[PDB]
Amino acid sequence: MKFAEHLSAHITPEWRKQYIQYEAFKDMLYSAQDQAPSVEVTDEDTVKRYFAKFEEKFFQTCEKELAKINTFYSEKLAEAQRRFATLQNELQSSLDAQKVQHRNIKDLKLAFSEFYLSLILLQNYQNLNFTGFRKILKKHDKILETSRGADWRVAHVEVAPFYTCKKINQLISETEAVVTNELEDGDRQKAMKRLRVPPLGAAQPAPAWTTFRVGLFCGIFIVLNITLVLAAVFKLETDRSIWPLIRIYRGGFLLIEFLFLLGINTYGWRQAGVNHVLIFELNPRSNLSHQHLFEIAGFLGILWCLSLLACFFAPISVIPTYVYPLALYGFMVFFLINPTKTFYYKSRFWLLKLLFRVFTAPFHKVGFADFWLADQLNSLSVILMDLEYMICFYSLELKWDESKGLLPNNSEESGICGVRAIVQCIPAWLRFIQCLRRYRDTKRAFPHLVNAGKYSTTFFMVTFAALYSTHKERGHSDTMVFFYLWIVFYIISSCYTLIWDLKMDWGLFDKNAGENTFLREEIVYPQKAYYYCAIIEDVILRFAWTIQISITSTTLLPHSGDIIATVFAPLEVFRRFVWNFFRLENEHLNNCGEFRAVRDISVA
Question: EXS domain: which residues?
Answer without folding.
Answer: 416-604
